[PDB]
Design a protein around this ligand. Structure first.
Ligand SMILES: [Ca+2]
Ligand SMILES: [Cl-]
Length: 223
């Protein structure tokens, strides 16, 4: 997260860190045994880390659980990043409490101008590389489809939306991928891609979760 602020320990209870000896992507807990993340975050040997704040120190409240299965959307395209969404089933159910809770799936899509909270342990610099120890937060509005497509001509599909600031300085970044974009208590987006980070006229692009609600439910019900 570039230009954000320190969330505060356990203030984003549904945030998860995907770990393979180091943090590589974020994710969102949607129920006691399933996590939603980005398809481009896929890899074998994933350990899901819940209830984290400082990812480099065991502080208490953390729950480490191995992924038993990762389900990348069958129509995911690695070149265009269309359908950049993945479901991860936990080997065992997480213990839900005030520090580890699930986030609700949307019943309807969000409209332009809606304020959302984006969070993660991704890079905090636009011109450099520096990963934070604690979870960072950023409040950002969903942009109109018109401005989104003007910013990235021919690259925005109906399964994506832009959020952020055109003047630059505030954006999600590398390492935040797969993380949550929550608006009005509902998971509306997944950190997916963008051109650089926090650059002028290049807002972040996010997977539009409202288009996948039925797919998520049907997939979870059969696994
Ligand atoms: Ca920790
Ligand atoms: Cl276009």
């Amino acid at each position: 997260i570039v230009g954000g602020y320190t969330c505060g320990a356990n203030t984003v209870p549904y945030q998860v860190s995907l770990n393979s000896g180091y943090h590589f992507c974020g994710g969102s807990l949607i129920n006691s045994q399933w996590v939603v993340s980005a398809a481009h975050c896929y890899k074998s040997g994933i350990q899901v880390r819940l209830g984290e704040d400082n990812i480099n120190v065991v502080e208490g409240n953390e729950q480490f659980i191995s992924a038993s299965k990762s389900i990348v959307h069958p129509s995911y395209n690695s070149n265009t990043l269309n359908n950049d969404i993945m479901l991860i089933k936990l080997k065992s159910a997480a213990s839900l409490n005030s520090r580890v809770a699930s986030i609700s799936l949307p019943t309807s899509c969000a409209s332009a101008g809606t304020q959302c909270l984006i969070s993660g342990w991704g890079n905090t610099k636009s011109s450099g590389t520096s990963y934070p120890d604690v979870l960072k937060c950023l409040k950002a509005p969903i942009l109109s489809d018109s401005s989104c497509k003007s910013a990235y001509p021919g690259q925005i599909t109906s399964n994506m939306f832009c959020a952020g600031y055109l003047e630059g300085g505030k954006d999600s970044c590398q390492g935040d991928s797969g993380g949550p974009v929550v608006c009005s208590g509902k998971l509306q987006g997944i950190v997916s891609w963008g051109s650089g980070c926090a650059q002028k006229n290049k807002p972040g692009v996010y997977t539009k979760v409202c288009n996948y609600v039925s797919w998520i439910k049907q997939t979870i019900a059969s696994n």
